[PDB]
Design goal:
part of a larger assembly, 2 chains, A: two-stranded antiparallel ribbon, 2 strands, B: about 170 residues, about 65% helix, cell cycle, APC/C, ubiqutiniation, D-box
């Protein structure tokens, strides 16, 4: 686990968080639906609810 | 149109008096469709001359709140115009870049959804904002790609005719 505590000397702000997250396109049999984007390996790496 | 012509010659103040009588005449007709045209022309004059935002009888924020929830049908291009003006106000207000990207996303998404070729005016305005938005962030690489789509010498209505020549001269 990485610990990036906020430091004043660190001016490397992030803007990816700022940009809206992408979405996937998946079509089921009924119609074409649209779902939030999830990385292929994010299911076992996502922030645990625990 | 006479109000637009006065703004074209940088009269500014004379255009304001002419525009005021346009609102009163619109009420006498008691037709709703023309008022949206009046309101759209309001801030477009404000966009060119932001120093006159106080003189108007309606603040800029009041229009955006109206145009966002104007209707769900028979608008087409009103929402594309409405969100673009919010993005400029947000950029000038130096709001958090979180809201600015989201507001610009709305304006971009609706503009490209319908035909961008026919609505050449707004498509150029999208590029002008996006090239400005990404240049302030410091990523000229993104700005360069959109810069190739910005049209030169086309300029826009109600802003002179030699404005394009002056703009190329400044650079």
């Amino acid at each position: 686990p990485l610990r990036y505590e906020p430091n004043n000397r660190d001016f490397a702000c992030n803007i990816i968080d700022d940009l809206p997250k992408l979405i996937r396109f998946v079509k089921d049999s009924k119609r074409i639906n649209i779902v939030p984007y999830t990385q292929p390996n994010s299911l076992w790496r996502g922030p645990d609810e625990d | 149109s006479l109000a637009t012509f006065h703004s074209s010659f940088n009269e500014c103040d004379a255009a304001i008096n002419s525009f005021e009588e346009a609102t009163r005449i619109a009420r006498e007709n008691k037709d709703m469709e023309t008022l949206n045209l009046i309101m759209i022309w309001i801030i477009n004059f404000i966009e060119v001359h932001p120093e006159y935002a106080n003189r108007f009888y309606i603040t800029v924020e009041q229009i955006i709140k109206y145009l966002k929830n104007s209707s769900d049908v028979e608008d087409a291009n009103i929402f594309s115009n409405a969100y673009k003006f919010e993005t400029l106000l947000s950029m000038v207000k130096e709001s958090k870049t979180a809201e600015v990207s989201s507001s610009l996303l709305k304006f971009m998404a609706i503009t490209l959804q319908n035909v961008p070729s026919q609505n050449f005016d707004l498509f150029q305005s999208l590029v002008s904002y996006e090239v400005k938005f990404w240049k302030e962030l410091g990523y000229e690489s993104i700005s360069d790609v959109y810069e190739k789509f910005l049209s030169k010498t086309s300029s826009s209505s109600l802003r002179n005719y030699d404005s394009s020549i002056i703009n190329q001269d400044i650079k």
